[PDB]
Design a protein around this ligand. Structure first.
Ligand SMILES: CCCCCCCCCCCCCCCCCC(=O)OC[C@H](COP(=O)(O)OC[C@H](N)C(=O)O)OC(=O)CCCCCCCCCCCCCCCCC
Ligand SMILES: CCCCCCCCCCCCCCCCCC(=O)OC[C@H](COP(=O)(O)OC[C@H](N)C(=O)O)OC(=O)CCCCCCCCCCCCCCCCC
Ligand SMILES: CCCCCCCC/C=C\CCCCCCCC(=O)O[C@@H](COC(=O)CCCCCCCCCCCCCCC)COP(=O)([O-])OCC[N+](C)(C)C
Ligand SMILES: CCCCCCCC/C=C\CCCCCCCC(=O)O[C@@H](COC(=O)CCCCCCCCCCCCCCC)COP(=O)([O-])OCC[N+](C)(C)C
Ligand SMILES: CCCCCCCC/C=C\CCCCCCCC(=O)O[C@@H](COC(=O)CCCCCCCCCCCCCCC)COP(=O)([O-])OCC[N+](C)(C)C
Ligand SMILES: CCCCCCCC/C=C\CCCCCCCC(=O)O[C@@H](COC(=O)CCCCCCCCCCCCCCC)COP(=O)([O-])OCC[N+](C)(C)C
Ligand SMILES: CCCCCCCCCCCCCCCCCCCC(=O)O[C@H](COC(=O)CCCCCCCCCCCCCC)COP(=O)(O)OCCN
Ligand SMILES: CCCCCCCCCCCCCCCCCCCC(=O)O[C@H](COC(=O)CCCCCCCCCCCCCC)COP(=O)(O)OCCN
Ligand SMILES: CCCCCCCCCCCCCCCCCCCC(=O)O[C@H](COC(=O)CCCCCCCCCCCCCC)COP(=O)(O)OCCN
Ligand SMILES: CCOc1cc(CC(=O)N[C@@H](CC(C)C)c2ccccc2N2CCCCC2)ccc1C(=O)O
Ligand SMILES: Nc1ncnc2c1ncn2[C@@H]1O[C@H](COP(=O)(O)OP(=O)(O)OP(=O)(O)O)[C@@H](O)[C@H]1O
Ligand SMILES: Nc1ncnc2c1ncn2[C@@H]1O[C@H](COP(=O)(O)OP(=O)(O)OP(=O)(O)O)[C@@H](O)[C@H]1O
Ligand SMILES: Nc1ncnc2c1ncn2[C@@H]1O[C@H](COP(=O)(O)OP(=O)(O)OP(=O)(O)O)[C@@H](O)[C@H]1O
Ligand SMILES: [K+]
Lengths: 198, 54, 361, 148, 99, 333, 56, 27
């Protein structure tokens, strides 16, 4: 965000979406929905007690913030093809998965069962984390920067290499193609300088 | 400068010369007031539906 | 739903031949771009930069680069994130040992006075900031606490060291000093010693001397070769006509900087009409030299477009002499009193002078 | 277009007045959201006008090219020069397609942002109506009209 | 491409039918004789909510409605764009083949 | 296994030093080495230095407490010197609290045994010295602009093209960051196993080559990509190169050095590169790249190192000069 | 152990200088004291670092 | 001594800058 205030480089820079980019975003959304569901359970369960029981939703309350920061951090590293920096994000997934798996099996110790909502949400969230960790190691498998050999990186697509390709709809991060967020800056230009064939 | 401002005009002058000329004081007072009455009836029918269900 | 844009897919070709609005004509009158702006701040926008990670690896370049409010955000958030993360760890470990359960027993807690996450966060303050309030002690009970205390101490010392380094390299910045060098808004052309030259004026405001000063001077113009090699910005160096032969300058008073237009100088074919408002031409003046106090090298970028060059004017003599010491009246800095001069080109002038001298001799 | 524009804007006024009447707290959130809505509407007009005119001015030469080739098909093939005219056709169609693509894309940008505003309105209206209903024993019927 | 457009449209229609169903659920539980009670189910120190009971709190159904409206009104727009883009590409291919 | 570059394409001078009578100065020069250490190794030495200091002084505190006997349990029979010391772990925590100046308090130093005061003074001095030294290494380490060197970027392979009659070895060098590198300076060296009439052999000879600047100086001003061209006159040692004599394994190399102090920190940084004969191309031109959009300027780094062709005579610089000399002589006559 | 502005001034010394004796602690009760503690620690570190830099 | 030295015998540039349109460069 500091380089951004002076990002004339990113004024007309180029990007390179890591492999499994579609599946990364759709999993983040499919876990943001069930984390909202977990928050609903947490706010709802403590309605019988006279203590707030923060340990029902505040874990999920920070999981939601963590996921948002994770996806923001992945997009940032996606614009700047600097994958070695995502090692931290990589360890986060596996570390988070391990901890929550303990919680899952602990419910199985007391015979909690799917009949309770928290078990269903926790199981769904655990398998989502497994798939997300699969994606995080998929990046390693392809680019192989941690591997012994040289990183078999690819150059940006030649479609965007040209200066005059100002319709960034085919190749933009999946959550700026559903909502056409890349259009926003162009519309400012419309107010400033008239939109002609140039 | 001048081109930008003039281009950024919604032309209410044209809308006024269009509507007020043909409609005068009778057709406009029929058209516009019928629209207002129609939408007020829509609000009223929804409100009455609510109170009857209650 | 409620629109009628899909009902009629037909078209009419009767109406055509619509053009000549004359609106875009005024848009073409917009002024062209300057290479470097007057107050430095070069106006070049790099495009299609392939980042390839060369804009995050040099982190400590970025930290110095950023503005002070952003630097204080990073400062504050680095410290607070460290404090809060280690507070979480202290809370969790003192909870695992049971010291959080009230009235557990006579079991000696592994960190005393931990009775909340609030006290855990205060304990992180005491440890990392090295404040050590006596209430929250570290006992000899569990080995994990001592390990985590070592780790937090080392991390706190490293973070303090890093922030000390960045504050060092930021409090010795240069861009707060580059702006205190003053040029003219416009430069002048005039004959000195019977030869045409391109004058200019530059001065210093702060008393702090600028050591080993250096004045590069370049012309920026699209220019082709006989081979058809077209260069959009073919910068050409220009000697500063300094008598010694070097370009160094001792800057105390407002000095007059100029390059004598000999046969080598690329300005050898300028005419007073050849430097009008929209002419493609631009002079750059790179004033280098360190700051005496901090010993940090600086530049003072500035430019002079065609529509700023003014023919046949001489800078008003700024220096006077007061009772005991000299006087510098910076109000007359950029004033250029009119001075008549031949209105022909540099080549025509040279050829005419040579022919007249040959005829006379 | 006058009838449909009047219908749309006045249905909007109808809906907003009913929401405010059912849940009076909604107007406190109506003011910021409307201001944000205003900016989108303002900017979209500036863009959409230009794109619409551009689209039209783009399609006129395209059909012209087609018609003129029907005139001198024999003449064009006579010079064996039709590669240049193929490239002219591709350029014209590319210009028309890019204009229409930007038009559709601007259309979809406006719709996504305006339906997000509506979704935020739904959440705000639902929260306020449910809160008031349970706490203040408000009539259930008015909640139904507010939601729908 | 066209199959993807139609699949997004079908899912948008399905998710869009939540609005009516969610309104019915909200009002039904909010008008059920105005009875307010806790979950009344506990397990090993923390209450465990069941399948239907999670659809109990009208707040939950309203928030789920909000999420459903976001997904509906983004999938639907995605469907619009894919169909529109294929249409603009059909015109391009046809306008070249005819010439 | 065919030809070894003198320097690699991106720095990393590739000469393997050997047979040094190492006086130990290399390990005697500790501060320079520490600054040149990679960050993980700097952190490891940092951590090991602190830990060793902590644990050494912890041993001393435990040993003196053992000598004074206060760790042997006692209720009122003793007046302790260093309070709360009741195990080695206690002495280790005490060493932490003193050296890092945490001062938790529960472990005080009393007035009884003076050797504790002496060891306290020594530990305070040593901790301050070690903090000062580690701060110094960190300060110099963060002033490194070796990272910045990876944004002064040259064209992959430079070309030889005519310009204004004669022939110059062009090049393209540019900047990616937003800052401005002050007092930039470009050297350019040719490398060849040159021999002499007397029989001298120079296995790798370096000859400075002018940058053909107008002012007659080295300094350059670099805001956008530049074309650094050496004009080949009779003095230059490329005056006798034939395009046919420019195959891959030619005994030649063109070192290029770009200097200039960084402005953010004030550190002088080189920027090295070379160009083997294969990486030299004849009679080709660099495509004009500095597009100017209205209201600004642009650089199309996509075509930063993309070249096209132009017909030029395929004769040596000497052959070209001599042939143009004969043509000029014929024209004059 | 806050009694008068003399005690409060001594406490501010012990926080910003990082002396930290221990009689004058910060407890868990009011979050505003912890907020002010964070503010004072950060401001103290900034001023100490800046004065270090100027001295260098 | 009616003669004004441009710099004195101890460095000490003996010039008095005047009419500076100051913009806070002292602070
Ligand atoms: C637990 C229950 C929770 C319920 C919520 C679930 C939400 C899940 C959403 C999942 C969407 C699933 C479809 C993803 C697949 C996209 C299709 C895809 O792969 O094509 C991507 C294409 C562009 O690629 P291309 O290279 O030009 O063509 C493909 C290539 N040529 C080939 O070989 O084939 O281009 C496309 O086709 C892109 C399509 C963009 C679609 C945008 C919509 C995404 C959802 C946006 C939601 C917004 C926020 C929602 C928040 C929810 C919770 C808070
Ligand atoms: C026990 C607790 C100790 C406390 C430490 C934690 C404190 C955290 C707060 C500090 C955060 C500061 C982050 C700064 C990172 C900057 C990274 C960066 O720009 O360079 C990354 C560097 C590699 O190149 P270099 O060292 O710069 O090159 C040498 C150069 N000539 C120079 O003068 O500078 O270095 C790297 O690439 C590594 C980046 C640092 C990431 C740390 C990861 C831990 C790795 C652990 C395994 C180490 C294995 C070492 C094997 C050999 C490595 C060469
Ligand atoms: C043998 C080649 C034959 C040709 C087909 C190759 C695959 C193309 C399909 C595809 O979309 O690839 C994806 C593989 O993403 C995944 O499949 C993610 C999960 C990995 C599972 C692989 C198991 C091994 C690549 O993802 P992407 O490149 O991000 O997708 C394009 C979207 N974009 C425009 C946003 C970048
Ligand atoms: C400016 C800032 C200081 C703010 C300090 C935290 C205040 C939260 C208040 C709160 O309920 O905290 C809770 C922690 O709560 C957590 O564990 C939450 C974790 C939050 C991590 C950071 C999120 C941003 C406190 O819960 P506890 O420490 O378990 O309480 C002990 C119980 N006893 C006192 C009855 C023995
Ligand atoms: C990270 C550490 C925290 C966790 C520590 C766990 C291990 C305990 C070590 C231990 O008891 O040390 C022992 C010695 O210890 C030595 O002699 C240490 C030898 C190694 C030090 C030098 C390494 C180089 C302690 O010895 P003591 O205190 O003399 O034992 C008497 C204790 N009493 C007075 C309570 C009866
Ligand atoms: C050479 C003289 C030095 C003598 C040492 C004391 C210096 C402080 C003055 C002083 O007595 O403070 C006192 C007043 O005074 C103020 O608190 C004045 C307001 C503070 C102004 C600070 C600068 C702005 C503080 O007193 P208090 O907290 O208002 O009273 C507490 C009650 N008690 C003292 C009985 C416990
Ligand atoms: C952050 C990301 C968004 C989180 C969405 C929260 C969904 C809440 C659904 C569950 C629910 O019933 O919550 C109601 C809203 O809670 C809230 O106000 C939720 C605030 C977020 C807390 C974490 C309160 O439900 P209640 O039954 O306690 O009623 C309280 C009297 N209005
Ligand atoms: C309602 C649902 C909540 C979501 C609200 C925010 C939606 C914005 C989606 C994020 C997005 O478009 O990301 C980038 C916008 O970044 C931004 O401008 C960040 C704004 C985020 C505000 C918080 C696009 O980045 P890109 O990859 O399309 O372009 C990168 C080249 N600059
Ligand atoms: C006949 C079957 C028609 C199926 C229509 C589409 C259903 C898709 C969403 C499922 C749905 O609406 O379920 C409700 C929850 O809302 C949701 O789950 C909303 C969609 C969630 C998006 C994330 C449960 O409502 P219910 O049926 O229990 O409520 C009334 C009981 N009388
Ligand atoms: C240029 C036309 O490109 C588009 C194409 C579409 C897809 C589409 O179904 N259209 C027709 C529908 C059919 C039945 C005529 C239509 C036209 C006018 C008003 C509303 C609608 N319906 C839209 C879908 C929901 C019900 C009402 C959307 C939007 C656009 C757009 O302007 O960007
Ligand atoms: N006395 C001065 N103090 C500060 N800046 C000055 C001074 N004289 C000139 N400048 C600088 O020179 C540039 C010219 O701006 P300005 O139009 O104010 O002056 P001018 O036209 O050269 O006339 P004058 O020398 O009479 O002020 C500006 O960048 C201005 O800051
Ligand atoms: N291998 C080497 N490594 C480092 N310094 C060396 C080496 N060889 C010579 N020197 C330096 O060169 C200088 C010459 O000293 P000395 O007489 O010992 O060597 P020399 O006559 O050059 O040796 P030799 O016979 O090996 O060529 C000294 O300053 C010495 O340190
Ligand atoms: N868009 C760009 N942004 C930044 N650096 C670039 C860009 N394009 C090329 N470079 C750099 O310029 C140098 C030479 O690039 P050039 O275009 O001549 O060849 P290349 O095929 O891109 O080379 P390579 O395979 O080494 O990346 C390399 O150091 C390369 O990293
Ligand atoms: K301290």
């Amino acid at each position: 965000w500091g380089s951004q205030s002076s990002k004339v480089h990113i004024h007309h820079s180029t990007w390179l979406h890591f492999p499994g980019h579609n599946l990364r975003w759709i999993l983040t959304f499919i876990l943001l929905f069930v984390l909202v569901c977990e928050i609903a359970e947490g706010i709802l369960s403590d309605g019988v007690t006279e203590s707030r029981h923060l340990h029902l939703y505040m874990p999920a309350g920070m999981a939601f913030m963590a996921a948002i920061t994770s996806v923001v951090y992945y997009h940032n590293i996606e614009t700047s093809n600097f994958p070695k920096l995502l090692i931290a994000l990589l360890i986060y997934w596996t570390l988070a998965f391990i901890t929550k798996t303990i919680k899952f099996v602990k419910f199985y110790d007391h015979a909690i069962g799917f009949s309770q909502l928290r078990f269903c949400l926790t199981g769904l969230l655990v398998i989502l984390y497994g798939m997300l960790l699969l994606v995080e190691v998929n990046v390693i498998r392809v680019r192989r920067y941690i591997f012994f050999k040289t990183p078999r990186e690819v150059k940006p697509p030649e479609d965007l290499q040209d200066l005059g390709v100002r319709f960034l709809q085919p190749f933009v991060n999946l959550l700026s193609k559903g909502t056409y967020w890349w259009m926003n800056a162009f519309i400012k230009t419309a107010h400033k300088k008239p939109i002609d064939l140039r | 400068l001048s081109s930008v401002l003039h281009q950024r005009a919604k032309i209410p002058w044209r809308a006024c010369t269009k509507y007020l000329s043909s409609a005068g004081i009778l057709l406009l007072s029929l058209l516009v007031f019928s629209q207002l009455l129609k939408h007020m009836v829509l609000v009223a029918i929804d409100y009455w539906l609510a109170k009857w269900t209650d | 739903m409620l629109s009628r844009k899909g009902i009629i897919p037909e078209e009419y070709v009767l109406t055509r031949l619509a053009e000549d609005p004359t609106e875009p004509r005024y848009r073409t009158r917009e002024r062209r771009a300057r290479f470097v702006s007057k107050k430095g701040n070069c106006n070049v926008a790099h495009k299609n930069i392939r980042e390839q990670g060369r804009f995050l690896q040099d982190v400590f370049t970025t930290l110095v680069d950023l503005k002070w409010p952003h630097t204080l955000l990073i400062f504050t958030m680095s410290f607070l994130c460290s404090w809060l993360l280690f507070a979480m760890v202290w809370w969790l470990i003192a909870f695992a040992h049971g010291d959080l359960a009230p009235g557990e027993g006579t079991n000696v807690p592994c960190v005393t006075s931990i009775h909340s996450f609030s006290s855990a966060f205060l304990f992180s303050i005491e440890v990392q900031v090295t404040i050590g309030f006596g209430g929250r002690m570290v006992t000899e009970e569990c080995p994990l606490a001592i390990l985590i205390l070592i780790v937090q101490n080392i991390v706190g010392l490293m973070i303090n060291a890093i922030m000390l380094g960045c504050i060092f390299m930021k409090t010795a910045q240069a861009h707060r000093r580059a702006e205190t060098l003053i040029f003219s808004k416009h430069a002048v052309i005039t004959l000195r010693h019977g030869r045409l030259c391109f004058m200019l004026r530059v001065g210093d405001l702060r008393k702090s001397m600028i050591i080993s000063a250096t004045i590069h001077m370049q012309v920026v113009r699209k220019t082709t070769s006989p081979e058809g090699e077209v260069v959009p910005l073919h910068q050409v160096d220009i000697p500063m006509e300094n008598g010694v032969g070097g370009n160094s300058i001792f800057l105390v008073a407002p000095l007059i900087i100029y390059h004598v237009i000999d046969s080598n100088s690329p300005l050898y074919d300028l005419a007073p009409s050849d430097l009008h408002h929209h002419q493609d031409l631009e002079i750059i003046v790179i004033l280098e030299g360190v700051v005496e106090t901090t010993g940090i090298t600086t530049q003072a970028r500035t430019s002079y477009l065609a529509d700023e060059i003014l023919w046949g004017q001489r800078f008003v003599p700024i220096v006077a002499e007061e009772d005991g010491r000299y006087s510098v009246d910076y109000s007359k800095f950029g004033n250029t009193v009119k001075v008549p001069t031949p209105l022909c080109t540099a080549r025509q002038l040279d050829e005419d002078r040579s022919l007249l001298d040959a005829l006379t001799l | 277009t006058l009838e449909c524009l009047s219908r749309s804007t006045l249905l909007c006024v109808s809906a907003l007045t009913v929401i405010s009447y059912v849940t009076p707290v909604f107007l406190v959130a109506l003011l910021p959201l409307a201001v944000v809505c205003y900016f989108i509407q303002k900017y979209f007009r500036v863009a959409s006008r230009d794109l619409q005119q551009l689209d039209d001015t783009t399609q006129l030469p395209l059909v012209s090219h087609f018609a003129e080739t029907v005139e001198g098909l024999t003449t064009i093939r006579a010079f064996r020069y039709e590669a240049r005219f193929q490239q002219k056709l591709l350029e014209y169609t590319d210009s028309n397609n890019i204009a229409s693509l930007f038009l559709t894309a601007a259309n979809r940008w406006l719709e996504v942002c305006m339906e997000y505003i509506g979704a935020c309105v739904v959440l705000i209206a639902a929260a306020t109506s449910i809160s008031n209903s349970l706490h203040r024993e408000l009539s259930a019927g008015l909640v139904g009209l507010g939601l729908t | 491409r066209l199959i993807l457009s139609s699949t997004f449209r079908i899912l948008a229609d399905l998710l869009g039918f939540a609005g009516p169903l969610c309104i019915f659920g909200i009002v039904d539980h909010l008008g059920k004789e105005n009875h307010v009670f806790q979950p009344k189910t506990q397990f090993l120190g923390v209450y465990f909510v069941s399948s239907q009971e999670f659809l109990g709190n009208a707040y939950v159904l309203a928030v789920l409605l909000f999420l459903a409206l976001l997904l509906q009104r983004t999938f639907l727009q995605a469907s619009y764009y894919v169909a529109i883009e294929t249409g603009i590409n059909l015109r391009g291919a046809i306008q070249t083949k005819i010439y």
